[PDB]
Amino acid sequence: MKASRLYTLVLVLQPQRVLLGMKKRGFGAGRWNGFGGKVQEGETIEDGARRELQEESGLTVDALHKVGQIVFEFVGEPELMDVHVFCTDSIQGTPVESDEMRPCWFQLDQIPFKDMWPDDSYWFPLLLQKKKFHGYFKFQGQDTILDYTLREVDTV
Ligand SMILES: Nc1nc2c([nH]c(=O)n2[C@H]2C[C@H](O)[C@@H](COP(=O)(O)OP(=O)(O)OP(=O)(O)O)O2)c(=O)[nH]1
Ligand SMILES: [Mn+2]
Ligand code: NA
Ligand code: NA
């Protein structure tokens, strides 16, 4: 048994494009990703996701919808990362570069998988199909998956 820490991840997914941010420092630096971070004491997971989206991208949204949950384990780290993944298609301002992220839109036939976390190749297609999922990935360092599970679910 390991303990886990709560994180969020938000994908702004529109009919023909998705907003990603280039992580400028910290965990996952150099990879395009959705927006998110640690859940803080007192806030719901969904509200922490909304907060991180605003902090990192400048976007303010009324609602998010849950699309998946991914648990990450790293060799040498006792704590698991329990990542709650959300989407929305509905925005009403423009993204802005933050200290953490440079936002950029990608067409959905140009998803930059080689410059994303390696596990995203497995679960992001499910997100694109609007299928909910649970995943688990064990990493050695930043690049190498040693074990993983991925399943479609009816409820996140
Ligand atoms: N797509 C994808 N996202 C991941 C993976 N692993 C992982 O932690 N994430 C997400 C979850 C969070 O959105 C983010 C990690 O949180 P963070 O380090 O940005 O947290 P934060 O904003 O609170 O921290 P800080 O950088 O402000 O100090 O990366 C992965 O393998 N794939
Ligand atoms: Mn944070
Ligand atoms: Na953050
Ligand atoms: Na973050």
From Swiss-Prot:
The impact of changing residue 27 to A is:
Reduces 2-oxo-dATPase and 8-oxo-dGTPase activities
In UniProt terms, what is the effect of altering residue 119 to A/N?
Loss of 2-oxo-dATPase activity, reduces 8-oxo-dGTPase activity
Q: Quick one: which residues bind 2-oxo-dATP?
A: 8, 33, 35-38, 117-120
Q: What Gene Ontology terms for biological process does this UniProt record contain? A: DNA protection; DNA repair; purine nucleoside catabolic process; response to oxidative stress
Q: Explain the regulation of its activity.
A: Inhibited by 2-oxo-dADP and 8-oxo-dGDP.
Q: Where does O(6)-methyl-dGMP bind?
A: 8, 23, 33, 117-120
Which residues take part in binding N(6)-methyl-AMP? 8, 23, 117-120
Q: Name one GO molecular function term.
A: metal ion binding
> What is this protein's pH dependence?
Optimum pH is 7.8-8.2 with 8-oxo-dGTP as substrate, and 8.0-8.5 with 2-oxo-dATP as substrate.
UniProt keywords (A-Z) are: Cytoplasm, Hydrolase, Magnesium, Metal-binding, Mitochondrion, Nucleus, RNA-binding, Transit peptide
The UniProt-reported impact of residue 153 to A is: Reduces 2-oxo-dATPase and 8-oxo-dGTPase activities and increases thermolability
User: What does the annotation say about its assembly with partners?
Assistant: Monomer.
The protein's name is Oxidized purine nucleoside triphosphate hydrolase
Q: What is the lineage of its organism?
A: Eukaryota, Metazoa, Chordata, Craniata, Vertebrata
Name of the encoding gene: NUDT1
